[PDB]
């Protein structure tokens, strides 16, 4: 079995840019939010970029930030489906173009 | 021994999609749940996808969500064996077909 | 940067996912008093210790252990992927064997042998 | 195990150590109200955000930032390797530039460019 | 830049088997122990093996376990220098021979 | 994209051995220390070696240990610039020459 030294640094990636269009009651309940609208879910690396993603999403009409987590690199936000989708697009486009991030497709459930 | 720089990012994978058909008493007690029915257990990466899997499980079948853990990337839920298996199948199908995630088989004990 | 350039250190992206493995399935036949005290358990019998990946499989291993033999579960830890349980040596070994056989034969996970101290 | 054998998945030992890198040196010029609220800071000025490895270098970056320009440190986090600070846009950019130049030129760390939103 | 999927599992290794022969006061103070004797320090992977190492060390004459940490994979114990050294040797020999661990030399400060 | 199994173990490395010669007030305040003298900062792997580095630092020179963190693998200490530099030098020499660890230069700001 070969052995190597791995110098570990964070990559630059959005691994999830997702809208739950019509969450079930239990999902609203676990976030502690109003049981209305869609939920956007973002996974980012490095984790500090959560605050940047939350700032992009929360600037848009109809978007309320549910939480910004710099410890896990996660953002969740609420809005109508169309607002949530375009804010996910704003995040993907900013991070791809400006920070050279690897990105995933916008996904929907 | 050589040295390489590793840019660490989360992968996109379900590593466990499991039903315990007839849990022992100690296992119901560790989850704090009613001592009836089957338990479904899911391991996901990136961890934020736990909320997506919980939403699919609750919409797929008459199950009770035990917890949704975005910190560990884990979901557990309860219901009759058929209901829990339906929920696991719907998670695995959606994550594979719609998210392009790596998946595992639906496993049973 | 300078360290990387002058060291000619290469760079790769690694997508991290958990593997599927039992890395420890161990019986302490006759624990010392301090080990029983650290688990907060009765100072009698053997202790079984299991290390699993991914960590959520701890609850599956605990269920098999308790169904396999007359053991008392000490803890089931889905945060660390760990299970510990207690009982007479033969019961603890039976439970460890049943965990290894299920994970190897039904799940196809990588498994270590049963080890004893 | 069966999954590994039939998938012909190879196995390597990786000795994990931290690298030496700034992965983020970023100014939010005009934060939204919710971002100021999440940091618990005055709702005025730009925010600077730094991601460092190894995480203990957060205190070094905070010291440079505060010495470089009239900024207010929001937090210094040696557990996550993170620094955030606030001030007028030109002060926040000066502090980020001074962090990048010190880490690149004095320490030889890998560094990203200064980024703006 | 190449990209690979890393299936992460714990290795089997003792990375540290160390005796501080005559700790300074501050080191005794940080462990909350009597300011006498040497300190043995063990780093193990997987972390659950801390309990096995603590059982081997604590069985020996003169050894008191300071702490056993299954969350970090760490053990610290106290005794006279010679007892601490032979207990570190007992741990290294058990884990190398029985569990096939990679091991380091016994080190001393 | 190919897949490999990575057996993860800690490496043996000091990644930071740093003196802040004249800290700003906010930095003394974040550590909760007297606003006088230099600060030494050490990053170690495996994390248990923090206690070994703290012991060497305290025995090397007239320094005050701020914290010894075996959870993060970190040590910080305070003293006059000469004392702090002596302590960092003794840590780097011992870890390189006696433990066979990878080290970094003694760095200054």
DSSP symbols for D2-13:
HHHHHHT--EEE
Cβ proximity of E42 and E65 under 8 Å: no
- Cα torsion F54, F55, F59, F60 to 10°: value is -50
Q: Retrieve residue E36's tokens.
A: 């006498």
Angle (CA) C57-B50-B64 rounded to 5° is: 80
Tell me the CA distances in angstroms from C46 to C67, C76, C94, D115, E67, one per residue in order: 17, 17, 12, 58, 21
ω before B66 within 30° of 0 (cis)?
no
Sheet holding E13-20, edge to edge: E64-69, E74-79, E38-45, E13-20, E107-108
Neighbours of D9 (CB within 10 A): 17
Sheet holding B38-45, edge to edge: B64-69, B74-79, B38-45, B13-20, B107-108
ω before E61 within 30° of 0 (cis)?
no
Cβ proximity of B106 and B89 under 8 Å: yes
Q: Retrieve residue C53's tokens.
A: 């990946």
Contact D57 F18 (CB under 8 A): yes
Collapsing DSSP to helix, strand or coil, B34 comes out as coil
Collapsing DSSP to helix, strand or coil, E62 comes out as coil
Contact F51 E4 (CB under 8 A): no
Q: Retrieve residue A108's tokens.
A: 């929907």
Domain span at D62: 1-117
* Technique behind the model: X-ray
Q: Rounded to whole angstroms, how far apart are CA atoms C88 and C86?
A: 7
Give chain D positions within 8 Å (CB) of F107: 106-107
SS in 3 state form for E3-55?
EEEEEEEECCEEEEEEEECCCCHHHHHHHCCCCCCEEEEEEEECHHHHHHHHH
Q: Rounded to whole angstroms, how far apart are CA atoms E28 and B59?
A: 56
Q: Which residue is it, tokens 């079930």?
A: A24
What are the helix and strand counts (H, E) for chain B? 3, 6
Residue ranges of D 10-49 with Cβ closer than 8 A to chain E: 13-14
Tell me the CA distances in angstroms from D8 to A9, D11, F4, one per residue in order: 28, 10, 9
Cβ proximity of F10 and D16 under 8 Å: yes
Cross-chain CB nearest to E5 (options B6, B7, B11):
B11
**Residue B9: what are its φ and ψ, rounded to 5°?**
-135, 155
Give chain C positions within 8 Å (CB) of D25: none
Mutation target for A interface from D11, D25, D26: give the one with most A CBs within 10 A: D26
Q: Is B100 left (phi over 0), alpha (psi -120 to 50) or beta?
A: left
Resolution, expressed in angstroms to one decimal = 1.5
Q: Retrieve residue E94's tokens.
A: 């058990």
Q: Rounded to whole angstroms, how far apart are CA atoms B9 and A95?
A: 15
Neighbours of B80 (CB within 10 A): 14
Q: Rounded to whole angstroms, how far apart are CA atoms A45 and B82?
A: 38
Chains touching B (3+ CB pairs < 8 Å): A, C, D, E
Q: Which H helix or E strand runs over B54?
A: helix B50-60
Closest CA in chain E for residue C51: E48
Collapsing DSSP to helix, strand or coil, C88 comes out as coil
Q: Which H helix or E strand runs over A27?
A: helix A25-31
Neighbours of F18 (CB within 10 A): 23
Closest CA in chain F for residue D77: F30
Give chain C positions within 8 Å (CB) of D104: 1-2
Measured in angstroms, the CA of E34 and the nearest CA of chain D are apart by 30
Per the structure, the count of domains in chain F is 1
């Amino acid at each position: 079995i070969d052995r190597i030294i791995q110098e570990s640094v964070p990559g630059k990636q959005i691994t999830l840019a997702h809208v739950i269009a019509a969450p079930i009651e239990a999902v609203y309940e676990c976030l502690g939010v109003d049981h209305e609208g869609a939920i956007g879910v973002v996974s980012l690396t490095p984790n500090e970029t959560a605050i940047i993603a939350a700032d992009i999403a929360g600037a848009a009409a109809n978007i309320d930030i549910c939480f910004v987590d710099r410890f896990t690199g996660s953002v969740m936000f609420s809005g109508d489906i169309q607002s949530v989708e375009t804010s996910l697009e704003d995040i993907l486009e900013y991070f791809k173009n400006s920070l050279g991030f690897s990105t995933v497709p916008l996904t929907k459930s």
